[PDB]
Structures are given as structure tokens and as C-alpha cells.
Symmetry: C4
Subunit: 333 residues, 4 copies
């Protein structure tokens, strides 16, 4: 594979169409899904030349640990839909690549099994029925060694995914929510989580500048600027279009991650030049999982690592921090 | 039906082509018809997160009455073209959904029959030959229980609909202007109407900021910012592109509605975030009528209600007023 | 015919392909030819409502004479290429419609014969070999009753029309430059013409703001803001994109006309709302001539008159002067 | 041939597909390759009229010598891939046209043989393993009569050309790096070159404004504003989009050239109107070489000379300096 699009083609061949659609689709007319890509394609980097590249490193420190790239695997529910080893295959590859892996509340393998793989697991929280059950899930994740709580804040309920409606998509009997034997989150829920863990709390799904500021004021250690891959509000702005304004407003008060449509190392460089600390990558990781299991995810992460190193050096950046100081110019496609 | 476009497909199958063209077409090159959609597709919403959604309501108060959604059925002439029950089918469904229905001067069932269905009828006025006949039509509507006079102000004469010209389109003998057994309106006509009814007068077809201000000064209770679905001046700006500037200029002096290309609950949310009090929806209501009569219109209104509730909650809005305080960002499509 | 595009289709059927290409083509990659249309399609009018339209007139006064529309027939060389009656057919139709007709230096019928048709003839000058011959041509036109000298200023030499090169296009033996039995113009040439006629001198092919100002200072009675239909510099800005800035800079010191891609009455309204006094129309007049001779040109001018009246009234304009006070908004297509 | 695109079509017919791909391709998704063309297509020139064109000259003085056009042949490695005479054919045609030819470090004929053709040779440097070998290459070029050192500064390593990867492209055994029997450059490398030659040093591949300023401060005699034809960082801004800002920042302190997508004399005029001193042209020269050897390159240069003269005169420019004072306006395509 020489690009992430090679993996997309491989996954479309292997997966049943309704499962490919569950993975690929967005809500409504898919305007926000397409806009995530349009927005990245409009950004051009202004590279710097002639800088010392003798020790080019793609590593970052985030939430108390080194990561090999400014990237983590995004939370994607129900990974056994894509390959029989599901989350364990992805987590193993992420561990071996030095990339954090986000364990989902709706994982198809229990969070303790995935955490036992090792690596740098984070845990994604969907707020449950009552505060007590939600905090017990956070405590399970912390006891299992997860390093951050990624509280998803853009799902008071799930969006209207018309491909899934039209296909009548349902989970096969062999895929379950393995952490179980939901109610809309509010700022009060965030405070309950913050008060009941020492782990950094990361709010995923922030798009408004004032919500990013409030996240810092609320004690978040990070945010993910995101429209949920275009799967929640159809017509929500792409995270990449709010990133620069959000980075300026928080002015270093928390880590600012972004997701949505990251499909190459050059896209990682664009996100960092707009001020992101790191990106999440969702669908491409599942393409690699579907195409070739653990080895497929390994190959994807090796390719992304090469593309990130390549883009950084071509742009004159010996570190991710230097990449954040690059300027950009919007173009037309 | 899971989107309004499903209804469009259904109506194209059933209607004779020349009737589909009378419904779908615009004037001239159809530049303004297409621009109504382009303009909405360029608007992206910046949703808010983590707000209390325990009592999410789509209701508004307008012109003295509660409506279940920030939406009314736009005036569309000659509804028996689309289904034998015509206006009565649409009015019944609107009444049952809690949505105001606009009775047309050129309705194919008399305004008194449609008003007898109940619900919240408004009456749309085209200015007649003389002031006396025009005021007698207003008085008929008021006596029949209509709640607002929607005075259409963008039709000094009808635009040049080339599809209708090319098709030689004419009304079948079985469709008539049932209120009868026109001259261009001016500001003097507006004053004559205002002086002769206690009902709110709503000027439909305002695009210039100074005409919106003059409408308030003239005693209008509302305006509809509209290019008449691209059927009048070809090259007229979309209403959605003037809405924000008009809302600022009137600064609460009247209700500001918008129409043209509203095709989902997400489009309703965009219109409200740009400052509209409510929208009108025209062609989709006739698609539903053609496809399945009263039950089709009911299904359309149920779908729109679900989409509006969904979009509002995903955007963190427990009320329409909160949706009007959302910010937007223009993108590229 | 219900649009000017109906005439284009008719002319393509009848004309030999190489003659259609001589008419339709531009220079180079045809970037400026296409941009003339793109630019008009981006302009949207903000119409006014509720104004008195009881005496809607499309007439203007220009260069000392009333014209029935804010339009003249652009200079197009060698009209016998398109129909055997050539310029006489076009001039007769223009006279009967009350539209000025521009007689070309490179007309295929002598300027005195075309002027004898009557109407409001203008004369277009290409600067000749020496001042004396050029002034003798101006004097012929004045003696024959031409009312204005349209000095074309964007042709120091002819542009590179690749369709004509590829086709090896040449004039048939039966088409000649009937005024004959060229050198680049300069500001000195303009002064020589101005000093040797009392007729208004109109500089056709101005795009830079400072050249429009210099034209006023040089004693021009008008300018035509134009890129020569995309036939001269490939990459020259469309006239319609410079019009507003030029109208502001001359601030009434001369008439400001525009051409390039005017294809409907709505396009005339756009040009006037951007500040033009009048437009020229070139290719569509030749489509009508090719399709149906004099009667075809008559039908084109009747259609344009109807479209201009329609667009003006729909926009609330009882006169061309009111149309010049309309505002516009740029959109995306 | 009447346009450069005629030569592209000719070269595609003759070259093996993998060699055409090595020539045509870019890195990654080819976003920067396409953007070089998009960016030029968005620029429109505002031509001036009525100026004296009696002595229109396309000549410039650059790096101490007259050139017949504001253009040089860009460095393109391994020209024997395209025709058996390779660099000698191109250099002969450039010499006869009065155009500088850039000899590559990776030329497939030795730099001394190409320099012996005569003309105005420049020499392009890729920084080698150690300073000593790199300076010996500069000294060879200077001893052979090269007039400028074009130090390429955007290749710390080569970009990821996916067409070449997919094709498994490799040099045929009959094509070698004839100057031989690389390490990333830095500002220190530039100073080493500057201190060891009296020739002007030209930094090729500058895009950031501060790197252009630093180039002047470092003693460069010129820069080439360039993204390396979209072959280095995928997502790098087109040089043409940075040119105006760079020309303002250096404020005459060095020559500012541009490359990337120049495909006509009109594109040369656009580059000069944006402030370039001259352009480089790469791929089209190789299309001409592939199509017809030396005579093909001669024909390309004659066509470009005609197109540059044509565009300059149509724009009212009797010299390249006048063309640099033209204004431009961005449009939409
Ligand atoms: C099939 C699928 C399942 C997802 N599941 C979750 C989830 O359980 N929790 C969450 O916060 N986001 C979830 N997401 C959103 C992703 O974390 C991510 O925000 C989004 O896919 C955008 O990144 P991408 O364009 O790289 O896929 C899911 C996305 C997909 C496509
Ligand atoms: C077939 C048809 C008939 C219409 N009849 C009327 C009318 O009688 N009075 C009126 O004010 N507008 C009339 N309109 C305009 C609509 O009220 C509305 O402004 C327009 O269709 C834009 O909304 P849409 O895109 O949702 O259709 C008509 C529109 C259509 C398509
Ligand atoms: C076939 C042809 C011949 C033309 N001949 C002349 C001419 O003799 N003198 C002149 O000033 N412009 C000439 N023009 C330019 C037109 O006057 C006009 O500027 C241009 O065609 C743009 O208008 P349009 O888009 O309506 O065709 C010619 C244009 C065409 C297409
Ligand atoms: C096949 C090929 C080989 C090239 N070799 C070199 C090189 O050896 N040195 C260099 O500085 N640039 C090299 N370039 C970049 C060109 O000099 C030039 O910057 C680029 O092709 C953009 O110009 P164009 O669009 O006119 O091709 C090469 C480009 C191509 C296509």
C-alpha cells in the first residue's frame, strides 16, 4: 500500500456492502462527511527550506506519555464488524507502532481485554443512564490502565445515518457491546467525571469557540475538534475549519486535537500547521483492519509514519512543534 | 420516506411531465432556482454541546398562535393539479401536524372550504384589478377565520417560466381558480390592506434590506425573505443570502421568515441560525401530495418534525430561540 | 424562440462548422471567452418591490438620440459570412427595433449602403496605415449620417484564434471588406479623431480604471468596457468585473457601456445594476441573422425587449436609471 | 503546433507510459501539481490600451546577460529518457532561441559537454555528501562557463511520486548521471557556495516570505518561487500564489523567478504582472524534446516567443518592465 486510498479499495472488496456503508456513511445528505475532505483539500502549506533535519522526529508528548506520531486511533465502535479479531488486532498494531488506541464504550471486546494488550490505551466514554454507572465505567477503564478519558460530547443521541436506515442495518448476533452484561451528557456530567478521576479528560466533538474555552475552564486536559466524521449533525462545520480559531482561544490551556478526513501524512501536517497537537484517524484504520487484520493496521501505521516524516522534512520541520509554526494559505480545488 | 428527496422521486414517477415541470421549474435560465439550493449548501452550522435537552421543543409562537414547528406550508396555487383532493388534503395534514397552511388567492378549492378544515389557516393575497375587490377578498379570508394575510409583493406580473412555455402548459378544465366566479401592488396597496384588517400583514417576496425596513415602517407584522422559488426574476438573489442582513436591519420589528429550497430539518436549522423566525416549504409539500395525498403530506410533516428535532438537539438547542443564537460559517461545495 | 440560446442552437445547425467557429471562438485557451459568462452568472440582483410600474420604459438617451432599449448591436465584421443579406438585414432589424447598429470598418457591405437603411447607425473604426486614411474613413461615416465613432482600442493587432488557425479559416471569395478598394492606435490617434469630428468618440475595449479616466480626460463621449469577446488577450479580465470600479472612477464624465456574454434581458439588468449606461450584444445577433435573416434578428430584438422589460419590472424599475441604482450580490455557481 | 498542449499530446503518443508518468507526475495525491494550474487559471490580467508598441521587445537582462524572453529552461534531470540526444538537443535549441538553459546535477550528458554547446548555460546544484564534493561540482560548472548556480533548496530528500512507485520506475541502463563516475542542504550550505563562487547564486524552491527575505540577506542573486512542479511536498502552496507577497518583501533585493505550470505566453504575462523577473518552464520543454528532438524544442521556443510578444502587446506593454506594472484580478474557473 502506498496511500491510504489503497486500503479503502481493499476494504470495499472484502466487506459486505452494508458493513462498508455503516463504516463509510454520514448523517443526512452527507454534507458534513464530504466537507471534512473538501476543507482539508483547500488548505495549502507554506513549507520552510534549508533547516537542520539531522534529527527529524515525529514524536510528541501528550497526556503524560510519548507517542511515536502526533496521531491516535479514533474511537470506532464494534470493530469485530470488520475482522474477527476486532479491537485486539487494532490495539496490538497501535501498541507496536507507538500510537495511542482509543477503547470504545461500545467495543466488541471488553475494555479490560483490550487494555491487557498493553500500549497506550485511552478510553472513550458515552454517558450512561445514571451518573453511577457512568462513573463505574470510568473507574473500570482507570483500573485497567487507560491513560485518558475521551468523553464524547457530540452525541446527545445518535444521528440519522440514511445508508443504515435504507439497508436496515443491524449488528450480527456475533457482535455485541462487550462492556455490558445512554442519556445526553451535560457540563454537569463533565464535572462529575473530572471529580472522579485523576486521568486527563478530553472532550471529543467540540466545534464552537466558546465550548472550547468552557472546556478549559471545566478542567479538560484536551479537546477533539470534530464533527464526528459527519455522522452527527448534517451541516455541522468541519473541525479543521474551526481549529485555528479554537487554538487561538484556548491559548495553550489544553491539548487541541482534530479529526475528520485525515487520509495522509500531508493531512497530518496540515492539521498541525493549523495548530493541532495531534489528530485522530478513524475510517482508514478500519479499512486496514478489514483488508488484512493486525498486519493491515501495522502496514497502515507504517505508511502514515513514513508520510508524516516525509511531509515534515519537506516542510523544514525537525519536530512537530516546528510544524505547528508553519503558515498555511487557502486555495481552490 | 427517510428524506424529502424520497418524496421528490415518488412525485416524478406519478405526475404527468408537464405538471412536474410546472411545479419544479423556475424563470429564465433557472439561475435563482439553483442558487436557492447552492446557498443553503454553503452554510454550515457551529453546533453547541453539553446543554440541557430534557425538554427539547420545536414549537414557536407566531402571529398570535402556537405552531408545532418553525414552519408553514408555502402558498402554492392550484393544488388539484397534483392530487384530486388538492388543498383539502394538504390543509388537513397541516392542521393535524400543528403547522400553519397558507390558502392561496389562486386556490383550486374555495378559501372558505379550506378554512373549514380548521387548523391555523393563513391567506395569501395577490392584488386584484381594483382596491375594492382586493379588500373584499381579504375580508372573506378574515370572516372565514384566516389568521394572517400573506400579501405576495414580488409579482407585479408573473415571471417567464420557459418549461411551461415550451410545454404549452395550461390548466386542465377540471382545475379552476375557485375563489373567483390582477394589477401590480404598491406600498399604497399594502397600506390599504393594513387599514382594513386587524390581522397581521406579512409581505412575501422581500429581498432588499431597505424594503424590509420599509415593511416594518408600513406596519407589517412579518416578511418572507424570498425570491419566489426562482420563479420571478431570474438572477434574483436567494432569500437565504439576504436573511442575516435583513434580520439585523429590522432588529425585532417584525417576524422574518424565509423560503426557497428548504429540503430538510437541517435546512430549517440553518435558516433559524441565520435569524429566521420560521420557514415556508413549497415544492416538497406538493411532492408528498402527489405521491400519496393527505397521508403523504402527513408523512412529510412527520419526517420534517423528526429532522428538525434531531438537528436542534444535535446542535444543543432546546428551543427555536436558542437555534437563532447559533453561529454559522460559509464553506465550499 | 423563448431564449437567446434557442437562437444559438438554430445557428449551429445552419452554419458551416468553420464559420460557426469563427463566430464562437476566442483567443488562446478561451479563458476570457468563458470568463465573460462565468462573471455574469456570479452576479445576483437585489430587486425592489412595490414600486409604481404604470409607465415602465426601457428607453434611454445616448449620444444625442433615444434608443428603445439600453442596448446596441456590437460591431461584428463580415456579416455576409452568416447570411447573404449580411449587414443590411441586421441594420434593417435594428432600425425597426429602435436599437443602434454599429457599422464595422470591416463590413462586407459598404458603410454608405448600410447607413442608407436609416435608423441610428454608429461607425466602428479600426485605425489604418496613416492618420489621413483613418480620418477619411471617419469623415465618410459622418457624411453618411453615422451618429458616433466607436474607436476600437484593444486591437493593436488581432489575437490568436486557435479554432481559425486549426481550421485554416479564410474568407470566401464572395465576402470582402467592402469599405476598401492597419496600424496600432495610440492616445495620439484618439486625439486626431476627436479633433476631426463633432460626433461623440467612444473607446471600445477599455478594462483598466486609469484608461477609463484617461478616456474621459481625452474627450471621449463614452467607453465600452470589454475584453473583445475573449478574442484578444487570452486572460484579460471580463469587462463586467471591471465595470463597477470604472463607473465609480469616471463619475458621470462619459457614458460607460459594457459587452461580453450578454445573453438575456436579465443579463442587461445585471449590467445596468453594475452601472452600465447600455450594453452591446454581438454573437447572439449573428446567431439570429444566420438562423433566419432579417426576420431572425427582429425576433431576437423583440425577445430581448420583452426580457429587459420583464426583468426591470420584476426588479421594481420603471426606468433604466432606476435599474442603475439596484444593488447586487456575488454568489457561487 | 499552435499551443503547448499540442506538444503534450505529441509526447504522450511517443513516450513509453512509465516515462510519460515520470515526467508528468507529482507527489502524493498530486494536489500541488494540479494547484499550479488552478492558480494560474484564476489570475486575470487588466491590460492597458493605446500605448506605443513600435519597439515591442521581450528581452530582459538577468544575471549579467541578455535573454531573448523572460524565460529559462527549468532543470529537468535525465533528459536522455525523452530523446537520444537528451540535454544536447535541448541546450542547442535554447542557445539558438536566446533562452538560458539550466544544466542539471543529474544530467544524462556531462555538464562540460552541454556547456560546450554554448548559449547561456546555468548550472543546477543538488547538495552532495560533503561540502568538498559539492564545491568541486560548482567549480566544474564555473570553469565550464556556466553563468549562475541554481541551488535547489526544496529537496532535503526526494518526494513520494506514487506513479513511479506503482510503475516500479527505474532508469534504463542506457541513462546515467553523467556528472558522476546527496545530503540535505542548509543555510550553511548556501553560504559555502556563495563564498566559493563569483557567480550569482539562485535559490530554487522558496515559498515562505521569510525564506525569500533570508535568501536576500544570505547574498542570493535570485530565487525561484516554486513547489518543484508539485513533486516535493504534496500540499505545498503554488509558487504563483506566493509570488506577489515575496516580490513585495524582497523589494528589488534579488531577481524573483517563478515556475510551475507555465503553459503559454499568457501565463508568462500573468507571472510578470504578479512581479516575476522571469519564469522557468519544465515539462513542456521535455514534451517538445520527446516529440521532435532539437527541432521540437526550437518550435516550442518559437511558439512561446510569439505568444509572449502577442500577450505583451495586447496588454499594452512594450517591455517586460511594463508588464511587471500591470495589475491583475482573481476570478473563478
Ligand atoms: C463506524 C464508526 C463508528 C464510530 N464510533 C464512535 C464511537 O463509538 N465513539 C466516538 O466518540 N466516535 C465514534 N466514531 C467517530 C470517530 O471517532 C471519528 O470522530 C470520525 O470517524 C472522524 O474521523 P475519520 O474521518 O478519520 O473517520 C465512529 C466513526 C465511525 C465511522
Ligand atoms: C407551483 C408553484 C405555485 C406557487 N404559487 C404561489 C402563489 O400562488 N402565491 C405565492 O405567493 N407564491 C407561490 N409560489 C411560491 C412559493 O410560495 C414559494 O415561495 C417557493 O416555491 C419557494 O419555496 P420552495 O423552494 O420550498 O418551493 C408557488 C410556487 C410553486 C412552485
Ligand atoms: C465574429 C466577430 C467579429 C467581430 N468583429 C469586430 C470588429 O470588427 N470590431 C470590434 O470592435 N469588435 C468586433 N468584435 C467584438 C464584438 O464587438 C464584441 O466586443 C464581442 O463579440 C463581445 O460581445 P458578445 O459576447 O456579445 O459576442 C467581433 C466579435 C466577433 C465574435
Ligand atoms: C521529470 C522532472 C525532473 C526534474 N528534475 C529537476 C532537477 O534535477 N532539479 C530541480 O531543481 N528541479 C527538477 N525538476 C523541477 C523543475 O525544475 C520545475 O521546478 C518543475 O517541473 C515545475 O515546472 P513545470 O510545471 O514547468 O514542469 C524536475 C521536474 C520534472 C518534471
Amino acid at each position: 500500500y502506498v496511500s491510504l486510498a489503497d486500503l479503502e479499495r481493499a476494504a470495499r472488496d472484502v466487506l459486505p456492502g452494508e458493513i462498508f456503508d455503516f463504516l463509510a456513511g454520514g448523517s443526512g445528505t452527507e454534507a458534513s462527511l464530504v466537507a471534512n475532505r473538501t476543507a482539508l483539500e483547500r488548505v495549502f502549506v507554506i513549507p520552510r527550506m534549508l533547516r537542520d533535519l539531522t534529527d527529524v522526529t515525529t514524536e510528541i508528548d501528550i497526556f503524560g506519555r510519548r507517542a511515536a506520531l502526533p496521531m491516535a486511533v479514533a474511537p470506532v465502535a464494534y470493530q469485530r464488524l470488520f475482522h474477527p479479531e476486532g479491537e485486539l488486532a487494532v490495539a496490538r498494531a497501535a501498541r507496536d507502532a507507538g500510537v495511542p488506541y482509543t477503547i470504545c464504550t461500545l467495543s466488541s471486546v471488553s475494555l479490560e481485554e483490550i487494555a491487557a494488550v498493553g500500549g497506550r490505551p485511552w478510553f472513550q466514554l458515552y454517558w450512561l443512564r445514571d451518573e453511577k454507572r457512568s462513573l463505574d465505567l470510568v473507574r473500570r477503564a482507570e483500573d485497567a490502565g487507560c491513560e485518558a478519558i475521551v468523553f464524547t460530547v457530540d452525541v446527545p443521541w445518535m444521528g440519522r445515518r440514511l445508508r443504515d436506515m435504507r439497508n436496515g442495518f443491524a449488528l450480527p448476533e456475533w457482535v455485541t457491546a462487550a462492556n455490558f452484561d445512554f442519556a445526553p451528557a451535560t457540563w454537569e456530567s463533565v464535572e462529575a467525571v473530572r471529580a472522579h478521576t485523576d486521568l486527563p479528560v478530553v472532550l471529543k466533538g467540540i466545534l464552537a469557540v466558546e465550548d472550547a474555552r468552557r472546556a478549559v475552564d471545566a478542567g479538560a486536559g484536551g479537546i477533539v475538534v470534530s464533527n464526528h466524521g459527519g455522522r452527527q449533525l448534517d451541516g455541522a462545520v468541519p473541525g479543521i475549519e474551526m481549529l485555528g480559531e479554537i487554538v487561538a482561544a484556548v491559548s495553550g490551556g489544553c491539548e487541541v486535537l482534530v479529526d475528520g478526513g485525515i487520509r495522509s501524512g500531508g493531512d497530518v501536517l496540515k492539521a498541525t500547521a493549523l495548530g493541532a497537537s495531534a489528530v485522530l484517524v478513524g475510517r482508514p484504520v478500519m479499512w486496514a483492519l478489514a483488508a488484512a487484520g493486525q498486519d493491515g493496521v501495522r502496514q497502515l501505521l507504517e505508511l502514515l509514519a513514513e508520510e508524516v516524516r516525509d511531509a515534515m522534512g519537506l516542510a523544514g520541520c525537525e519536530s512537530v512543534g516546528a510544524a505547528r509554526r508553519l503558515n498555511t494559505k487557502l486555495g481552490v480545488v
